[PDB]
């Protein structure tokens, strides 16, 4: 899925689009290798599925590399997901997959 990802002023897909289409992750966010199966659904349900299983580590990694704010979000606590996910190109792939 990388070799068919770039082509011509280029336009590239972030891997998050492919994860949105259904392909299951491997080692994101400092978790254990090979935790996710492909039976994770595709789209919003699949995204929620693979996020909720990691959310605590998902936020402690964010707080462990700089990303911190004084806003107790009900989901991610104090880490500022709004800046990092934009940085890590998560929103970009997630909204480019839908086009």
């Amino acid at each position: 899925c990388c070799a068919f990802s770039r082509q011509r002023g280029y336009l590239q897909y972030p891997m998050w689009s492919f994860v949105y289409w259904g392909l299951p992750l491997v080692k994101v966010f400092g978790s254990d290798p090979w935790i996710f199966s492909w039976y994770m659904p595709t789209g919003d349900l699949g995204m929620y599925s693979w996020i909720s299983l990691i959310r605590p580590l998902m936020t402690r990694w964010m707080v462990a590399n700089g990303y911190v704010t004084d806003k107790c979000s009900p989901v991610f606590g104090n880490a500022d997901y709004r800046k990092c996910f934009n940085e890590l190109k998560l929103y970009q792939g997630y909204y480019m997959a839908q086009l």
Binding site: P56, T59, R60, C72, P74, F76, G77, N78, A79
Partner: peptide, 18 residues
């Protein structure tokens, strides 16, 4: 590091966590 259990927010000392 000490983490909450209601919103997963992470702190750095038990009194802060409490």
């Amino acid at each position: 590091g000490y983490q909450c259990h209601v919103c997963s927010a992470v702190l750095f000392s038990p009194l802060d966590l409490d």
